[PDB]
Amino acid sequence: MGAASMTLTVQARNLLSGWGIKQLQARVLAVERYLRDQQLLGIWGCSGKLICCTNVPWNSTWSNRNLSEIWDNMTWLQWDKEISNYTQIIYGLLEESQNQQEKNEQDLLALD
Amino acid sequence: GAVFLGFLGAAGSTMGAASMTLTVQARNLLSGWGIKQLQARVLAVERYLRDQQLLGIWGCSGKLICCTNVPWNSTWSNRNLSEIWDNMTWLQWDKEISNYTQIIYGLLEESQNQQEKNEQDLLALD
Amino acid sequence: FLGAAGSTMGAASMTLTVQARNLLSGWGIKQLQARVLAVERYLRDQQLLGIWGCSGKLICCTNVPWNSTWSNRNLSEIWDNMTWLQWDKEISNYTQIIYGLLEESQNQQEKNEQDLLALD
Amino acid sequence: AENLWVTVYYGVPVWKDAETTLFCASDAHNVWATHCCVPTDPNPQEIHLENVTEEFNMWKNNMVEQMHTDIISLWDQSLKPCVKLTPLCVTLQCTNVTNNITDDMRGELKNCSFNMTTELRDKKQKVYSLFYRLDVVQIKEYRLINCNTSAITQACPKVSFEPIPIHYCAPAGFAILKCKDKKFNGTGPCTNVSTVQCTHGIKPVVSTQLLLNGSLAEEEVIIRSENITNNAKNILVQLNESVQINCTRPNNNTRKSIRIGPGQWFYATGDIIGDIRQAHCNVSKATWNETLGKVVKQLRKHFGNNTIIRFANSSLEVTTHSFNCGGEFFYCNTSGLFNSTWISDSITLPCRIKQIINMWQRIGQAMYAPPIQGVIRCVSNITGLILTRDNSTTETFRPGGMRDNWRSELYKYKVVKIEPLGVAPTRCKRR
Amino acid sequence: AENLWVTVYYGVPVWKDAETTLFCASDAHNVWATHCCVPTPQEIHLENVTEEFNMWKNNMVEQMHTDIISLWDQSLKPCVKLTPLCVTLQCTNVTNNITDDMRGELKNCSFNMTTELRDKKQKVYSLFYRLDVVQIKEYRLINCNTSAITQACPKVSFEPIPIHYCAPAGFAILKCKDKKFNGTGPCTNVSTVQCTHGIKPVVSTQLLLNGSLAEEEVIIRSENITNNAKNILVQLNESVQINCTRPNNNTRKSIRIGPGQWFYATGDIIGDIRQAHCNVSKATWNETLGKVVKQLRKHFGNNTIIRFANSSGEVTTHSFNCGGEFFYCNTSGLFNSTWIDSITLPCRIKQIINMWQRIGQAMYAPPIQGVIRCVSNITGLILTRDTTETFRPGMRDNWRSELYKYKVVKIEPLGVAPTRCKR
Amino acid sequence: NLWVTVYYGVPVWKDAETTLFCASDAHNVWATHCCVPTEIHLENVTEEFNMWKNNMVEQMHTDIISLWDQSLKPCVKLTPLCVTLQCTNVTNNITDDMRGELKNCSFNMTDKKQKVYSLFYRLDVVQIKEYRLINCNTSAITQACPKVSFEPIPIHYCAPAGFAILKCKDKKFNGTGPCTNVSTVQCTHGIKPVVSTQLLLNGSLAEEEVIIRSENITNNAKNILVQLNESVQINCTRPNNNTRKSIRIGPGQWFYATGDIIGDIRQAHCNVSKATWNETLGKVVKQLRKHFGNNTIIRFANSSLEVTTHSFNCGGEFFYCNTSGLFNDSITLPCRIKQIINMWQRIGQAMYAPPIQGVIRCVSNITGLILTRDSTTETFRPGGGDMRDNWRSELYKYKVVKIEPLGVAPTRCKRR
Ligand SMILES: *[C@@H]1O[C@H](CO)[C@@H](O[C@@H]2O[C@H](CO)[C@@H](O[C@@H]3O[C@H](CO)[C@@H](O)[C@H](O)[C@@H]3O)[C@H](O)[C@H]2NC(C)=O)[C@H](O)[C@H]1NC(C)=O
Ligand SMILES: *[C@@H]1O[C@H](CO)[C@@H](O[C@@H]2O[C@H](CO)[C@@H](O[C@@H]3O[C@H](CO)[C@@H](O)[C@H](O)[C@@H]3O)[C@H](O)[C@H]2NC(C)=O)[C@H](O)[C@H]1NC(C)=O
Ligand SMILES: *[C@@H]1O[C@H](CO)[C@@H](O[C@@H]2O[C@H](CO)[C@@H](O[C@@H]3O[C@H](CO)[C@@H](O)[C@H](O)[C@@H]3O)[C@H](O)[C@H]2NC(C)=O)[C@H](O)[C@H]1NC(C)=O
Ligand SMILES: *[C@@H]1O[C@H](CO)[C@@H](O)[C@H](O)[C@H]1NC(C)=O
Ligand SMILES: *[C@@H]1O[C@H](CO)[C@@H](O)[C@H](O)[C@H]1NC(C)=O
Ligand SMILES: *[C@@H]1O[C@H](CO)[C@@H](O)[C@H](O)[C@H]1NC(C)=O
Ligand SMILES: *[C@@H]1O[C@H](CO)[C@@H](O)[C@H](O)[C@H]1NC(C)=O
Numbered sequence A: 001m002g003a004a005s006m007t008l009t010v011q012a013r014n015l016l017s018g019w020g021i022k023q024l025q026a027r028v029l030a031v032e033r034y035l036r037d038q039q040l041l042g043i044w045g046c047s048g049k050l051i052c053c054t055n056v057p058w059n060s061t062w063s064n065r066n067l068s069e070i071w072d073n074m075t076w077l078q079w080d081k082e083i084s085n086y087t088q089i090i091y092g093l094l095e096e097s098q099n100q101q102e103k104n105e106q107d108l109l110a111l112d
Numbered sequence B: 001g002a003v004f005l006g007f008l009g010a011a012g013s014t015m016g017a018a019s020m021t022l023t024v025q026a027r028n029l030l031s032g033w034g035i036k037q038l039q040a041r042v043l044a045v046e047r048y049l050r051d052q053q054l055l056g057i058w059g060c061s062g063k064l065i066c067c068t069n070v071p072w073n074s075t076w077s078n079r080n081l082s083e084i085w086d087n088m089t090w091l092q093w094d095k096e097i098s099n100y101t102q103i104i105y106g107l108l109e110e111s112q113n114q115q116e117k118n119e120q121d122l123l124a125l126d
Numbered sequence C: 001f002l003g004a005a006g007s008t009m010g011a012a013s014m015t016l017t018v019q020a021r022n023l024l025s026g027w028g029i030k031q032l033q034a035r036v037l038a039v040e041r042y043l044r045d046q047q048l049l050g051i052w053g054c055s056g057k058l059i060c061c062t063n064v065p066w067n068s069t070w071s072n073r074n075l076s077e078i079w080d081n082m083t084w085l086q087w088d089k090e091i092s093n094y095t096q097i098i099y100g101l102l103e104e105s106q107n108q109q110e111k112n113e114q115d116l117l118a119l120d
Numbered sequence D: 001a002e003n004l005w006v007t008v009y010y011g012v013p014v015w016k017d018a019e020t021t022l023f024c025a026s027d028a029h030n031v032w033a034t035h036c037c038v039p040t041d042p043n044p045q046e047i048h049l050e051n052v053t054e055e056f057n058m059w060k061n062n063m064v065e066q067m068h069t070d071i072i073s074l075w076d077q078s079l080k081p082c083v084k085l086t087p088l089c090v091t092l093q094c095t096n097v098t099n100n101i102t103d104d105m106r107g108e109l110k111n112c113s114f115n116m117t118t119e120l121r122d123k124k125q126k127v128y129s130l131f132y133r134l135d136v137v138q139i140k141e142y143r144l145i146n147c148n149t150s151a152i153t154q155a156c157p158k159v160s161f162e163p164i165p166i167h168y169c170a171p172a173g174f175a176i177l178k179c180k181d182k183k184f185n186g187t188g189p190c191t192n193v194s195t196v197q198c199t200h201g202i203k204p205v206v207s208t209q210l211l212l213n214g215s216l217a218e219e220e221v222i223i224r225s226e227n228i229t230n231n232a233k234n235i236l237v238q239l240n241e242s243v244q245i246n247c248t249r250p251n252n253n254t255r256k257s258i259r260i261g262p263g264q265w266f267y268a269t270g271d272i273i274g275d276i277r278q279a280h281c282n283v284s285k286a287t288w289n290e291t292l293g294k295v296v297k298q299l300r301k302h303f304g305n306n307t308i309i310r311f312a313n314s315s316l317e318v319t320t321h322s323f324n325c326g327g328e329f330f331y332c333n334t335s336g337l338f339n340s341t342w343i344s345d346s347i348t349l350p351c352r353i354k355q356i357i358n359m360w361q362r363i364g365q366a367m368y369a370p371p372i373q374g375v376i377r378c379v380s381n382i383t384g385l386i387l388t389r390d391n392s393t394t395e396t397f398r399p400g401g402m403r404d405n406w407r408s409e410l411y412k413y414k415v416v417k418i419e420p421l422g423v424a425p426t427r428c429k430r431r
Numbered sequence E: 001a002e003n004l005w006v007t008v009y010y011g012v013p014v015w016k017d018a019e020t021t022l023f024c025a026s027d028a029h030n031v032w033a034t035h036c037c038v039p040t041p042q043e044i045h046l047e048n049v050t051e052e053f054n055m056w057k058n059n060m061v062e063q064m065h066t067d068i069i070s071l072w073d074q075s076l077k078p079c080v081k082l083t084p085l086c087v088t089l090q091c092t093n094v095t096n097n098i099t100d101d102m103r104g105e106l107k108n109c110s111f112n113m114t115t116e117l118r119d120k121k122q123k124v125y126s127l128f129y130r131l132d133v134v135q136i137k138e139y140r141l142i143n144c145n146t147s148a149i150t151q152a153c154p155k156v157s158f159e160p161i162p163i164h165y166c167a168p169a170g171f172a173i174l175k176c177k178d179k180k181f182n183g184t185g186p187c188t189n190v191s192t193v194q195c196t197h198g199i200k201p202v203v204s205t206q207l208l209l210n211g212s213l214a215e216e217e218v219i220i221r222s223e224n225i226t227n228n229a230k231n232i233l234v235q236l237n238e239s240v241q242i243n244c245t246r247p248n249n250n251t252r253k254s255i256r257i258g259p260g261q262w263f264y265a266t267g268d269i270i271g272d273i274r275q276a277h278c279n280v281s282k283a284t285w286n287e288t289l290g291k292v293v294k295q296l297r298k299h300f301g302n303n304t305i306i307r308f309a310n311s312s313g314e315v316t317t318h319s320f321n322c323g324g325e326f327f328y329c330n331t332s333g334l335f336n337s338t339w340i341d342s343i344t345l346p347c348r349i350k351q352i353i354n355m356w357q358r359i360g361q362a363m364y365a366p367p368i369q370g371v372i373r374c375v376s377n378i379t380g381l382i383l384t385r386d387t388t389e390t391f392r393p394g395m396r397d398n399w400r401s402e403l404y405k406y407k408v409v410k411i412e413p414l415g416v417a418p419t420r421c422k423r
Numbered sequence F: 001n002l003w004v005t006v007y008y009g010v011p012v013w014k015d016a017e018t019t020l021f022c023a024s025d026a027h028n029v030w031a032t033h034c035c036v037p038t039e040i041h042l043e044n045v046t047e048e049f050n051m052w053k054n055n056m057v058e059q060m061h062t063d064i065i066s067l068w069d070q071s072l073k074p075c076v077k078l079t080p081l082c083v084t085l086q087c088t089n090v091t092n093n094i095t096d097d098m099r100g101e102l103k104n105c106s107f108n109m110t111d112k113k114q115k116v117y118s119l120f121y122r123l124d125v126v127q128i129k130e131y132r133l134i135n136c137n138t139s140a141i142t143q144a145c146p147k148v149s150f151e152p153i154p155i156h157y158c159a160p161a162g163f164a165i166l167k168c169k170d171k172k173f174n175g176t177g178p179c180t181n182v183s184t185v186q187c188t189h190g191i192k193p194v195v196s197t198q199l200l201l202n203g204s205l206a207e208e209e210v211i212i213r214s215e216n217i218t219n220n221a222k223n224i225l226v227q228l229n230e231s232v233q234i235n236c237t238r239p240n241n242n243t244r245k246s247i248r249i250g251p252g253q254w255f256y257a258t259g260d261i262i263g264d265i266r267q268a269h270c271n272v273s274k275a276t277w278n279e280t281l282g283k284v285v286k287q288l289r290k291h292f293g294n295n296t297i298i299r300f301a302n303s304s305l306e307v308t309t310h311s312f313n314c315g316g317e318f319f320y321c322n323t324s325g326l327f328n329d330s331i332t333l334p335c336r337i338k339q340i341i342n343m344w345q346r347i348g349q350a351m352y353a354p355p356i357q358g359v360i361r362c363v364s365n366i367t368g369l370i371l372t373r374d375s376t377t378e379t380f381r382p383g384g385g386d387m388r389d390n391w392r393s394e395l396y397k398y399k400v401v402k403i404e405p406l407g408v409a410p411t412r413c414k415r416r
């Protein structure tokens, strides 16, 4: 998955590019899908980033493969399938961690 | 239907607790013959973007909670923190100070413009 | 709003916010299309800034140098006795060279930051 | 707590009253079935707002106005791509149908003949059909009630106009606040408020005077009106028990399909296989008498405990009890249901049938309801009443009432707009 | 000179010429009022901005033209089609105290019309203008068999209430404030506006009614002054008031023509029958031409004799609508003599209107009930040209004369420039 | 030890059904519709394709029908054609079978009642010397506007943003299963929306061998689509030099009638070289036997109007032909010309196709066949109808997927 992620921009850019109602539906949908993904990154504290670290530990429940093998002789398509039943879980955890982190920062900033 | 849970659950709670459920409200924005439905969808996007643009203008992009460098004026509200927080609900707060929101928003933009310039001048060697 | 259009850059650079907030606020299919188009144009510009390290900024400084083949002027020449309209004409070309460079710099910067974070 | 600073919060749980566009949603050939294209669960989840008091107002509820508009618009849309009966706007020659007819009906049905077009423009055919008296007028030549006003479109026999529950759902950024207060009169503060995405499911039943198949009060009879002392306003009465009513058209009818043009068909009443009997509806006596007494008790609560309450009849569409049973239109008499004075086994209501139907008080449009074969019977639940009022200590109430049918179901809901940004003072400032 | 880096700025005041769709707004049964439902006065001066404005290459006019045609065609879609009226009319002369100048003007026509209920016919009659029918006492309607004629719904008003065109988000309208600007080229007094502030969509030929006035001088504009293939648009700095009347007390004869359809016929005329003329003050007209000529000479010479001539062989007349009726006024009494108390002009009336420049899709204008008067302002003229020179009286130009000062531009807020900062 | 890292721009996709739009390179209904003007190899991608579950096919079917109705809708309806028609036979210089093929008819059109005459093909008219125009009595017949062209032009289907089209490059892909040579495109190759039955005209050829595809090769209820690796040229002509007669209907409404034939009357026909056909059929059977068994000798049979005869739109005029003799120097197939067309499989509204003046000649490429099944040796017959198979033959290599560029993976880092 390393080589596959050397650049995350070529596939990130131009996702907003270019009776007749169906053409509007296609355009409206493209915008909505774009915004939904950006919305999710924002609430996880990853706005503006393609790669971000978080404070949610990785569970062996989700996967018990080591970093070797996961990140090398494998790709993203089967990876996504292997952990497809945990995405709701992970997203919920990311949301909770971000909310607590912002509160903690607000308090530290107020204290000094 | 997993997302629509706890939405406005904190509405009757005090501000002190409600401030910890911001994600829940935020995650339910957007989301959710056929001649009026596109207007409904377009509007949801437009309202969303207007709020995000405004946070961007104020230098709060990417945050649910952002601190500014603008002092609070006692003329907008002369209450102490212990009477606002851990006492009032957000609805009660919104029914008050509603006459000063434009004032606050305007001066927040001016503050950010000063900051954008100061950063450009101080990012330079000096 | 555009009152600063005839002012020189650096003066006309003040209160950029007035021109930003007014980009979103102030048979029937044509109006529906107009609303969609304004949204798409807004987002195309925001994505372009967003892919650079300029997300949420009005003034953004980055690591891409001038090679002095584009502007072909010094700073007194550029930031005085010159409007933004004139400047846009003076460097109407090279636009995408710069955009490509800004993206490459940002991708490299992000990768370097993630390794520095991890290796600590 | 001095030298406080502005902090901006996004995702703040507040709202303001607002009007917007609602979506049609449903559970899991029909006018609403092909409109609600969004699946949703019946009995959607509610989020209770534990300490929220909110102001509700059943009147000036835009949800009602939007529903009224949606029902009419869908009706017109489904009726649009159907056979026009302009070729039927001809002089008729009619006689009486008196072959095996009981009394109180002579003159109700007529045997009418006319010269109709065929597939070719140079050919004509002699055809005949039966018509109901209410739709046929003197110029023994007769005219239809149409032509004098407007054109008539035949309803497509292939599409059902039966109500199904439909749910109204908020667009993103909006929310529906539902009042759970067991007994409120349509206005004022509500102290038990929950948030939902969709309404409970309302059947768009169209009727007059008596409200059929609605939601019953869970406790007592609830009387609601915009202004109870203003005789110009209607009173909506919500019952806590249903009164069951048996409606029927006992005659076994046939349908005569006539080709009038190039794939253009007219569906005529053919003939009657059995004898001719009057359409009617049956209400149990004990149930009605007690139901009415419950209403009276609640009226005394507002009009005096020493007053006299009278029920009198109405002053066609708003005079009789209109409903659609089995797909056929009925105009039933209510006399005998409102025939009493209250101081300190069943009833039969005769019914008339029209085939030409105009709707929502519009004049410029008309629909021809094709006949249906066989015998019609349905059973409905009377869930509420629409009543009106006329120095005196004796007060007379009468049946009455367009939008009241929906206002009576949407009373628990309010639509609000979410306003996620706000500011407040704190001790946090930027470095 | 050294160590400079790229920075970007968002909210930069730049723009480019652009073509977009503008939307309509209005200030508070009218055809435009129904369409222009949006309610609506900001203007920002640009102190040091010079900009290029144009005409004839200006797309705002094209949008207005299209919107007007569209609105009219849409408006007539649900109205009664006078399909069953291509019948032979039995027409005799109306002789009821008809004056000498219109002896052959009106016809009394009877015919067999279809009734509702399909089976019967009715004998009805109506009055027609001599310009509405064709003799073959045997008459037929003009051009009913090249096109069906649609009756305008009598309830719809076409009063030219001011129309405001407003920019969509991301766009702005620039205005030229140069009081003497000769149509096109650079303008050094420029401001930005949100809306055009209200243009009355008045439709006419030869004379432009109820428009804008110049503030200081009569302005003569043309794409090519030197050619004879362009119209000259003349904007006056003072209006000329003109009265019009149709003094014939006709009534509306309502005929049911089908199952919910009505035709509105001209009924019997009450009283004597007279022309429907218009009145222009002599002094105002004589001075107005003198003002035009003094400015016109700037392109022709001060020793050049300038003559005004009559119409060349709808357009050879002054077409306008007033009170809902269509007028065709004779302007031969105007535009006379050479340069180096009132005049009354006769007008004709027509009921079958081929709007703009189309062959079919004709409209029937129902008669108005009673008698009308209208008072209008002549605000400009459209003139053409053939030693000495002549000028003669002569749809987009009606709007070019109102929108010459407006331009639409697209805002492009993202800019790039060098400075001394980086990270 | 490990933490969740969030990645945006992740190269992951899922099967999806969306709305695609039309594009082209430069009066024609597709030219006025396809206003949009107009590859990457994936090194280790093995994707599953299924041409019979491909919704791109349904999109074409729907778009084409809608485009046709949209174009024919705003044209004159031939209301006054449903009149008693009076007819006699054409006897003027007819080459022996067109005896009884052409009729000379007259009628009274909307005093009015104007008597007019025109010629009709036998297949257009039904008896009640008293006649009626076929099917005018069951549905409205409208006249196609003569200014509208239905000539097929290449159509490219393009993905909306967020979607991509995967293409199978496997030289022998048989319509289902995994493909190990997958590339991504934004737009498909151009497909000409040629409408025909039995023989598929002007498509793309197989690159190496004949490819025989079906949902189930042993199920005789399904059609077999055969893609050839070489084209067969077919030359179709309508030899008669006719003229057109303009008849006023009403207030600017005109009917276009077939006028009299100038010169001799000859039979419409199509022809194919014998050697080419023989070898072509030989290629098909060599490979067809791989699914049905060896020890077999070549044998075919003819068909069971649009299904039993070949149908195409020739030069803008609907043309039908007898394929018997292809399936049992050159072979000539007799042909018939017809007006009053019920498109696809509808039995509702019909279009009247006005005549084209002059002799019509068209030459096209046979690129594939639709065959059905009748030890028992070979028993195959031409099949056809539905017209979705006509697009399956071009779209079989394409699939639409949704891109979902966001996901997570464990990493060694932690946010500070
Ligand atoms: C109030 O709700 C009741 C049901 O709780 C409605 O009565 C039912 O209405 C349906 C729809 O017309 C009837 O279905 C029909 O059944 C016959 C066979 O008997 C079938 O051939 C038809 O195609 C159709 O499916 C149903 O039988 C009837 N129930 C009873 C007890 O008669 C009632 O119509 C609603 N009231 C109003 C005013 O809509
Ligand atoms: C130039 O502007 C003047 C007004 O400044 C226009 O004249 C006015 O036109 C309106 C609409 O035709 C007249 O209103 C009508 O009056 C009758 C009176 O019985 C009423 O029944 C109608 O419902 C309607 O209100 C108005 O009276 C008339 N004003 C004058 C002074 O006569 C004029 O038509 C415009 N010129 C052009 C060419 O558009
Ligand atoms: C298969 O492809 C071939 C080649 O593209 C198609 O042949 C072409 O068909 C069109 C339509 O009939 C011909 O256009 C016409 O040409 C005449 C020439 O006199 C002109 O007067 C007409 O106005 C029109 O432009 C075109 O010339 C012809 N091309 C060639 C090389 O002969 C064929 O129709 C396609 N087959 C099918 C079933 O679609
Ligand atoms: C998800 O749950 C289903 C339950 O039937 C199971 O079959 C599937 O293998 C699970 N997927 C993963 C990634 O664990
Ligand atoms: C409701 O008010 C009581 C007052 O004592 C408070 O304790 C409780 O926490 C409030 N409810 C919520 C949900 O905050
Ligand atoms: C316009 O230029 C003059 C030059 O003297 C300057 O004084 C003035 O401030 C400038 N105005 C603006 C808006 O920049
Ligand atoms: C309806 O309300 C009356 C009030 O007196 C009560 O006696 C009766 O039991 C209630 N019926 C139901 C079904 O709750």
Ligand SMILES: *[C@@H]1O[C@H](CO)[C@@H](O)[C@H](O)[C@H]1NC(C)=O
Pocket: D244, D245, D246, D282, D283, D284, D346, D379
């Ligand atoms: C209504 O019909 C039902 C059918 O089961 C019957 O049991 C009930 O008694 C009827 N009620 C009346 C008032 O006829």
Ligand SMILES: *[C@@H]1O[C@H](CO)[C@@H](O)[C@H](O)[C@H]1NC(C)=O
Pocket: D315, D319, D333, D335, D350
């Ligand atoms: C039916 O209603 C009319 C009033 O519309 C009333 O006079 C008549 O008496 C009623 N029928 C019966 C049986 O009472």
Ligand SMILES: *[C@@H]1O[C@H](CO)[C@@H](O)[C@H](O)[C@H]1NC(C)=O
Pocket: E090, E110, E111, E112, E123
């Ligand atoms: C109307 O029709 C009758 C015959 O029904 C005929 O005698 C009469 O002349 C016709 N009149 C006109 C004006 O066409």
Ligand SMILES: *[C@@H]1O[C@H](CO)[C@@H](O)[C@H](O)[C@H]1NC(C)=O
Pocket: E134, E136, E140, E141, E142, E143, E144, E145
């Ligand atoms: C059309 O009408 C005109 C009268 O306007 C008449 O002279 C002409 O003969 C008519 N032509 C046809 C084809 O009916």
Ligand SMILES: *[C@@H]1O[C@H](CO)[C@@H](O)[C@H](O)[C@H]1NC(C)=O
Pocket: E224, E226, E227, E228
């Ligand atoms: C009309 O304008 C062109 C330039 O667009 C110019 O060359 C030509 O000479 C002008 N016509 C006359 C008569 O001068």
Ligand SMILES: *[C@@H]1O[C@H](CO)[C@@H](O)[C@H](O)[C@H]1NC(C)=O
Pocket: E243, E244, E245, E277, E278, E279, E342, E344
């Ligand atoms: C024009 O002036 C004459 C003078 O006698 C007068 O009678 C007539 O009514 C006037 N017409 C108009 C339109 O003012």
Ligand SMILES: *[C@@H]1O[C@H](CO)[C@@H](O)[C@H](O)[C@H]1NC(C)=O
Pocket: E241, E242, E243, E279, E280, E281, E282, E342, E343, E375
């Ligand atoms: C036009 O009408 C006005 C009405 O006030 C009148 O004063 C004026 O004199 C008239 N003009 C002419 C030329 O008659």
Ligand SMILES: *[C@@H]1O[C@H](CO)[C@@H](O)[C@H](O)[C@H]1NC(C)=O
Pocket: E286, E289, E335, E336, E337, E338
């Ligand atoms: C205008 O008035 C002057 C007065 O001297 C006269 O010579 C000239 O011919 C008049 N022109 C017109 C057009 O009336």
Ligand SMILES: *[C@@H]1O[C@H](CO)[C@@H](O)[C@H](O)[C@H]1NC(C)=O
Pocket: E330, E331, E332, E333
């Ligand atoms: C206009 O008036 C002049 C006056 O001499 C006359 O010659 C001309 O014929 C009139 N116009 C028309 C169309 O009659």
Ligand SMILES: *[C@@H]1O[C@H](CO)[C@@H](O)[C@H](O)[C@H]1NC(C)=O
Pocket: F087, F088, F089, F099, F100, F129
């Ligand atoms: C036309 O030919 C058919 C046979 O093809 C025959 O039945 C019919 O009677 C002939 N009609 C005439 C008028 O000759």
Ligand SMILES: *[C@@H]1O[C@H](CO)[C@@H](O)[C@H](O)[C@H]1NC(C)=O
Pocket: F084, F085, F086, F106, F107, F108, F113, F115
């Ligand atoms: C036209 O109508 C007349 C009416 O007498 C009839 O005799 C004639 O045969 C009809 N002609 C045609 C071709 O239908």
Ligand SMILES: *[C@@H]1O[C@H](CO)[C@@H](O)[C@H](O)[C@H]1NC(C)=O
Pocket: F169, F170, F171, F180, F181
């Ligand atoms: C297609 O797949 C075959 C599998 O054997 C391979 O040999 C060939 O090189 C591949 N071609 C392309 C273009 O990928």
Ligand SMILES: *[C@@H]1O[C@H](CO)[C@@H](O)[C@H](O)[C@H]1NC(C)=O
Pocket: F216, F218, F219, F220
């Ligand atoms: C394929 O067709 C044969 C025909 O007999 C049938 O038995 C078999 O089950 C079918 N298989 C599939 C996957 O449809």
Ligand SMILES: *[C@@H]1O[C@H](CO)[C@@H](O)[C@H](O)[C@H]1NC(C)=O
Pocket: F235, F236, F237, F270, F271, F330, F332, F361
């Ligand atoms: C084959 O078709 C051509 C038309 O391209 C024709 O000229 C030729 O005569 C036909 N072949 C035979 C044997 O008739």
Ligand SMILES: *[C@@H]1O[C@H](CO)[C@@H](O)[C@H](O)[C@H]1NC(C)=O
Pocket: F233, F234, F235, F271, F272, F273, F330, F363
């Ligand atoms: C079709 O026509 C071409 C010339 O255009 C000719 O070479 C070819 O042999 C013909 N094909 C047949 C089957 O006759």
Ligand SMILES: *[C@@H]1O[C@H](CO)[C@@H](O)[C@H](O)[C@H]1NC(C)=O
Pocket: F302, F303, F304, F308, F324
């Ligand atoms: C197939 O060929 C046989 C040969 O006898 C023939 O009778 C039959 O009608 C043909 N079928 C078709 C549809 O051409």
